[PDB]
Nucleic acid binder design. Structure first.
Ligand SMILES: *OP(=O)(O)OC[C@H]1O[C@@H](n2cnc3c(N)ncnc32)[C@H](O)[C@@H]1O
Length: 635
DNA sequence: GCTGATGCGTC
DNA sequence: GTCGGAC
DNA sequence: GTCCGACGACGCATCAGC
C-alpha cells in the first residue's frame, strides 16, 4: 500500500518484503530507485550508502529478481558491458533541447538556468501515463543508444520527452542526471558491488516465496557478521575483476548463489578483465619507503595506449582497452602479428602490453598524439599509416591456466620464455632489477631520453600477484613531472572563468589561461585549468576573481576557438601551472605560427600549483618560451 | 556532397 | 589523465 | 589507502545543417 513516494530504504530494521513499495512479482517502480538515490545523496559515509542501496537490492531480490540487473545498471549509470560499446549519443545540448520541449520553455532560458545551478536535473524537475518502472526506464535508455543514422537525434529527443512527461516527484531530476552522465551519487562500481554482495548474503536469492531467510546476519555477532560480509564481498569482487560483466554474473548469482559463483564465472581469454593500475609516487625515496624490504623491478613507462591481448584456444585474437572496450577491429596489424610473437607451444594467453606509435623508417617511438590519429575500425592492414610496436610487460593467462595468483617474478619468467621479440613490433618493456638509488635515478633519466614518461616500479615476490580485488593499484608510477623542480612549469594569466558543476556548483569550476605574445602584445589562450586547488583555494579564487568580471573581453585577449568563458576576467592574476608536456593544439592560439603555421600549443594534464603574486600579466610565460619548451620536447 | 559541432573514448 | 576530500 | 567525482587536451566517428 506504500506509495513509492514514501519509500525509505534508509530506515532501521529494513524488511525486504514489508518495507518495499511494490508487490511481489510487480515491476520495481523507478520512483523506488530515485528515492533510494535521494537517501544515498543525503549521507557522506560509504558504509551508510552501501547499506541503503543493499536494502533496495534485497527487496528486488526478494520480490522482482528480473529487475535486479536493470536496477544495478541504473545505479551505475551504465548501459551494459563495456565491450559491447553501447553509447547514448546524448549530450547536454541534446538534453536541454528535450527539457525545453518537454517544459514548454525556451532553449536559452533552460540553458542559462542549468549553467547557474550546475545541475540539469533540478531544471528538468522544477518545470496521464502509468508510473515509470526501473526496467522500463532502463529499456528506454537502451533504445536511445540504439538509435542511429540521419534524424536519429530527433528520435532520441522524443524518447527523452516521453520519459519526462511521465516523471513524478524526483524522477525527472535523476532521469536528466543519468542521461547527462552526472548522477553524482557518491557511490559507484566498488560500492555497488559491496551493496550487491551484502544484499544477496543477507537475503539469498532463489527461495520459495515468501522467503524464509530475509536477514541471514541476524543470528551472528556483529563481529562475525562483518567478517562474513567481507569474505562474501571478496568472492564477488575477485570474480568481477576477472569477469567485469554483470550480464554474465547476475544470472549465475541468482541461480547458484554467491558462494558458488567462482565455479561458474572465471578468467577466460575473450572476456576482458580489470587491469592492474598504478599509484603515483613523488620520488625514488617514496618508492623505497613504500616497498621497504621487498625486491622490485623498474620498467620504462611507455607513452602509448594499453592493449590487453587475448589469444583464444583455436586461434581467435581479441584486443581490449584499459576500460574493457573492444579494440579488435582497430588493430588488424597486431592480429596478423600474433603468430610471430608466441612460440608454437603457446595455445592461448592473455598479455598486458602498451601499444606505442612506431616510425619504421627511423626506428623510433612516436608521441602519443600520433598514435591517436589511427582509425577506430580499420579492415585492411594495408591502409594503416601509423604503425605500432607492442611493449609487453605482463602475462596474465597461459595455455589454459590463470596466472593471477602467481608473483610477478614468475609471470615475467613465463613471458620471457614463451614469447619472441621482434624489433619495432613486439618487445619486452625495458627493465632493471635493483635497489641501488643511483642506478634507479640513472635508469629514470634514461627512460625519458628514450621517449618515455618515467618508470613503473613493481614488486617481484612480495605482494606481487595480479589480484585486483586485493589491491587495484599495486604498481607504482614515477613520472618525470611528479618530481619537484622537474617538469614543465609555466606562469599563465587568468583570462576567463567557467561555472562549476556538481561539487563545484555555485563556484568557478575551471579557468581559461593565456600566455603572453610579446610580438603582438596580446594574451593568447593556451589551455583551461580545473584541478590542483584545494576547496579553500578554489573558494578564495571565486571571491577574488568575482571583482575582475567584465561584460566583454579586452581587445588584446585572443582565444580563437576555445570555449568562451562564462565570465571574462581582467588580465591580472598570474598562476603557476605544471603539466606533463606540451601538445600541438587544433584550437588554442598560443604560439600559433612559431612551431606550426596552423596550430598553436596547449598543455597536457595541466594542474594548479600556486598563485604568483609577484608577477603581472606582462611578465607571464611568453608564447616564444612556450614554443621553445615545445621544441626541446621533440629533439 | 561538404563542413563543423560534439559525443565519448584515449591519455 | 591529475587532483582533493571524507572515511 | 580506498573510493569517488570534480576538472584537463585531443582524436575519430557521427550527424545536423548547409
Ligand atoms: O598514469 P597511469 O596510472 O595511467 O599509468 C599506468 C599506465 O601506464 C602504461 N604503461 C606503460 N608502460 C608500462 C609498463 N612497462 N608497465 C605497466 N604499465 C605501463 C599502461 O598503459 C598503464 O595503464
Amino acid at each position: 500500500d506504500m506509495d513509492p513516494s514514501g519509500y525509505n530504504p534508509a530506515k532501521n530494521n529494513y524488511h525486504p518484503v514489508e518495507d518495499a513499495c511494490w508487490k511481489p512479482g510487480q515491476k520495481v517502480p523507478y520512483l523506488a530507485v530515485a528515492r533510494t538515490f535521494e537517501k544515498i545523496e543525503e549521507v557522506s559515509a560509504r558504509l551508510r550508502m552501501v547499506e541503503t542501496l543493499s536494502n533496495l537490492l534485497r527487496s528486488v531480490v526478494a520480490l522482482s529478481p528480473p529487475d535486479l540487473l536493470p536496477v544495478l545498471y541504473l545505479s551505475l549509470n551504465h548501459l551494459g558491458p563495456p565491450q559491447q560499446g553501447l553509447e547514448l549519443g546524448v549530450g547536454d545540448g541534446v538534453l536541454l533541447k528535450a527539457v525545453a520541449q518537454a517544459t514548454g520553455r525556451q532553449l536559452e532560458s533552460v540553458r542559462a538556468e542549468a549553467a547557474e545551478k550546475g545541475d540539469v536535473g533540478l531544471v528538468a524537475e522544477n518545470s496521464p501515463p502509468p508510473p515509470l518502472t526501473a526496467s522500463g526506464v532502463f529499456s528506454k535508455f537502451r533504445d536511445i543508444a540504439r538509435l542511429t543514422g540521419s534524424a536519429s537525434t530527433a528520435k532520441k529527443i522524443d524518447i527523452i520527452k516521453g520519459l519526462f512527461v511521465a516523471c513524478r516527484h524526483s524522477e525527472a531530476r535523476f532521469i536528466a542526471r543519468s542521461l547527462s552522465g552526472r548522477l553524482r551519487l557518491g557511490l559507484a562500481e566498488q560500492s555497488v558491488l559491496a551493496a550487491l554482495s551484502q544484499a544477496v548474503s543477507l537475503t539469498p536469492p532463489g527461495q520459495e516465496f515468501p522467503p524464509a531467510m530475509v536477514d541471514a546476519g541476524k543470528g551472528k555477532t556483529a563481529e562475525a557478521r562483518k567478517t562474513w560480509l567481507e569474505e562474501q564481498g571478496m568472492i564477488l569482487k575477485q570474480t568481477f575483476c576477472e569477469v567485469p560483466d554483470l550480464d554474465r554474473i547476475i544470472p549465475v548469482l541468482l541461480e547458484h548463489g554467491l558462494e558458488r559463483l567462482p565455479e561458474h564465472c572465471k578468467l577466460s581469454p575473450g572476456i576482458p578483465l580489470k587491469p592492474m593500475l598504478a599509484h603515483p609516487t613523488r620520488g625514488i625515496s617514496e618508492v623505497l619507503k613504500r616497498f621497504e624490504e621487498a625486491a622490485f623491478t623498474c620498467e620504462y613507462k611507455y607513452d602509448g595506449q594499453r592493449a590487453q591481448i587475448h589469444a583464444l584456444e583455436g586461434g581467435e585474437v581479441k584486443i581490449f582497452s584499459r576500460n574493457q572496450e573492444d579494440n579488435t577491429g582497430k588493430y588488424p596489424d597486431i592480429i596478423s602479428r600474433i603468430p610471430k610473437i608466441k612460440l608454437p607451444s603457446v595455445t592461448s594467453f592473455i598479455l598486458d602490453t602498451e601499444a606505442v606509435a612506431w616510425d619504421r623508417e627511423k626506428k623510433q617511438i612516436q608521441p602519443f598524439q600520433v598514435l591517436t590519429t589511427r582509425k577506430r575500425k580499420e579492415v585492411d592492414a594495408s591502409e594503416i599509416q601509423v604503425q605500432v610496436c607492442l611493449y609487453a610487460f605482463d602475462l596474465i593467462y597461459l595455455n589454459g591456466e590463470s596466472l593471477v595468483r602467481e608473483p610477478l617474478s614468475r609471470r615475467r619468467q613465463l613471458l620471457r620464455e614463451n614469447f619472441v621479440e621482434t624489433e619495432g613490433e613486439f618487445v619486452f618493456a625495458t627493465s632493471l632489477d635493483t635497489k641501488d638509488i643511483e642506478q634507479i635515478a640513472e635508469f629514470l633519466e634514461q627512460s625519458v631520453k628514450d621517449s618515455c614518461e618515467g618508470l613503473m616500479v613493481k614488486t617481484l615476490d612480495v605482494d606481487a600477484t595480479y589480484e585486483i580485488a586485493k589491491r587495484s593499484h599495486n604498481w607504482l608510477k614515477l613520472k618525470k613531472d611528479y618530481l619537484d623542480g622537474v617538469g614543465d612549469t609555466l606562469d599563465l594569466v587568468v583570462i576567463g572563468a567557467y561555472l562549476g558543476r556538481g561539487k563545484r556548483a555555485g563556484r568557478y569550476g575551471g579557468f581559461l589561461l593565456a600566455s603572453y605574445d610579446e610580438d603582438s602584445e596580446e594574451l593568447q589562450a593556451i589551455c583551461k585549468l580545473g584541478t590542483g586547488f584545494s576547496d579553500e583555494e578554489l573558494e578564495e579564487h571565486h571571491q577574488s576573481l568575482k571583482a575582475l568580471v567584465l561584460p566583454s573581453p579586452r581587445p588584446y585577449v585572443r582565444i580563437d576557438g576555445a570555449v568562451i568563458p562564462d565570465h571574462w576576467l581582467d588580465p591580472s592574476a598570474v598562476w603557476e601551472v605544471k603539466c606533463a608536456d606540451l601538445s600541438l593544439s587544433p584550437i588554442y592560439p598560443a604560439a600559433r605560427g612559431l612551431v606550426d603555421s596552423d596550430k598553436g600549443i596547449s598543455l597536457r594534464a595541466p594542474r594548479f600549483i600556486r598563485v604568483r603574486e609577484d608577477k603581472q600579466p606582462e611578465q607571464a610565460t611568453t608564447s616564444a618560451q612556450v614554443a621553445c619548451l615545445y621544441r626541446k620536447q621533440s629533439q
